[PDB]
């Protein structure tokens, strides 16, 4: 019924938007992967899964800021692989647990081919992870917007 980031900018129960300040790998290369492990940064939990039986999925993912420019990657949900930006529904991964579990998303952003110069400006938007919350208890199809902001600057080095 809720989702919270590591920085403390938590989304209220009804949904809403908050910032995800993500500490990145300051240099990644083409072929190598910028593994922005949001599984270690944004997490989600349910109020009581005994009757709610929540179903929490990544209904939307968008590339804004630095990632939109060069870094084109793939969203990994529970080990699977989907085209990021997430233009399709992702299969439900429940979080039938009161205790918080680390929201298994991981954007594998391998940058575009050789890109150019400096990429992913510090303090700039990385992505927008719009999460869907559903359950069999009611029709509370609730909206959780994470605006992923880069905490630091990656480079796509020349060579």
């Amino acid at each position, epitope marked *: 019924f809720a989702c919270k980031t590591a920085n403390g900018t938590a989304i209220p129960i009804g949904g809403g938007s908050a910032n995800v*300040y*993500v*500490n*990145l*790998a*300051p*240099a990644v*290369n*083409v*072929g*190598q992967n910028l593994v922005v*492990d949001l599984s*270690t*940064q944004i997490f989600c939990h349910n109020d009581y899964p005994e009757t709610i039986t929540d179903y929490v999925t990544l209904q939307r993912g968008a590339a804004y800021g630095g990632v939109l420019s060069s870094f084109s990657g793939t969203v990994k949900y529970n080990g699977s692989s989907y085209p990021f930006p997430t233009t399709s529904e992702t299969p439900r991964v429940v979080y039938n647990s009161r205790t918080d579990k680390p929201w298994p998303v991981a954007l594998y952003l391998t940058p575009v081919s050789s890109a150019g110069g*400096v990429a992913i400006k*510090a*303090g700039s938007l990385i992505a927008v992870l719009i999460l869907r919350q559903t359950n069999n208890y009611n029709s509370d199809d609730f909206q959780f917007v994470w605006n992923i902001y880069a*905490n*630091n*600057d990656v*480079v796509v*080095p*020349t*060579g």
Partner: antibody, heavy 121, light 109 residues
Framework: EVQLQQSGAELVKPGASVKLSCKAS????????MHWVKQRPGQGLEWIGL????????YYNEKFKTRATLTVDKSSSTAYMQLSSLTSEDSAVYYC??????????????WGTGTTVTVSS | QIVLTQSPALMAASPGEKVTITCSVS???????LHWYQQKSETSPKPWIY???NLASGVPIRFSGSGSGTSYSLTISSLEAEDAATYYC?????????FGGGTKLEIKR
């Protein structure tokens, strides 16, 4: 612990590029990021740049663009530096390093031996 | 370029004294973006703090950075004599990656 070695304090005339070398074949170059920095006497450090051992891709500083050329030789795991137009403004100790993976951050986890570049005439 | 001004060059402490080596940044950078490196005199440097709060390998528990924004510190609970070295502040917010001018932490005897 596996470390990085470096050349001894070498002599270079003004206008001569050094061949400063940091090498270590015991920690598998195709795993880390192989950075370079510079420390002047009195004046503080100045980040020189980076090259990837896996693919020989470099990113330097604006103050060090067309100043230092950090190369990699991962087969022998050697890294040299080209310093054409080496003036006394570049007379400094020059250090090798690499980014580790400490938590979500990357940082100069292991340093080289260190080598003093003297550009006195 | 990112200006990074510290306590300019001078420091001094006894075996146990606190050293509040400040690191003022021209922009309010996040705690993720700051590093500290220890370089002993005529000796190779060592990573001392990465990410403003997480110490590197071999750095004792006495060192611990803090702060955010444009003010940055390296609070030391008990500085021993062996730690006498120049501590260079580094940013990795932007990519001049401008190191500091370095505070030569000497020893006050």
């Amino acid at each position: 612990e596996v470390q990085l070695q470096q050349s001894g304090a070498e002599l270079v005339k003004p206008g001569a590029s050094v061949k400063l070398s940091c090498k270590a074949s015991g920690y598998t170059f195709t795993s880390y990021w192989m950075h370079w920095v510079k420390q002047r006497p009195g004046q503080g450090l100045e980040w020189i740049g980076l090259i990837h051992p896996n693919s020989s891709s470099t990113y330097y500083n604006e103050k060090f663009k067309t100043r230092a050329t950090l190369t990699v030789d991962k087969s022998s795991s050697t890294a040299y530096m080209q310093l054409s137009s080496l003036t006394s403004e570049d007379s400094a100790v020059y250090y090798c390093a690499r980014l580790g993976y400490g938590n979500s951050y990357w940082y100069f986890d292991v340093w080289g031996t260190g080598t003093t570049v003297t550009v006195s005439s | 370029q990112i200006v990074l001004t510290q306590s300019p060059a001078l420091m001094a402490a006894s075996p146990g004294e606190k050293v509040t080596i400040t690191c003022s940044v021209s922009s309010s950078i996040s705690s993720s973006n700051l590093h500290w490196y220890q370089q002993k005199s005529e000796t190779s440097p060592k990573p001392w703090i990465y990410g403003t709060s997480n110490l590197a390998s071999g750095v004792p528990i006495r060192f611990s950075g803090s702060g955010s924004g444009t003010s940055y510190s390296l609070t030391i609970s008990s500085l021993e004599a062996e730690d006498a070295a120049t501590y260079y502040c580094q940013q990795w917010r932007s990519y001049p990656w401008t190191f500091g001018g370095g505070t030569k932490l000497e020893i006050k005897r």
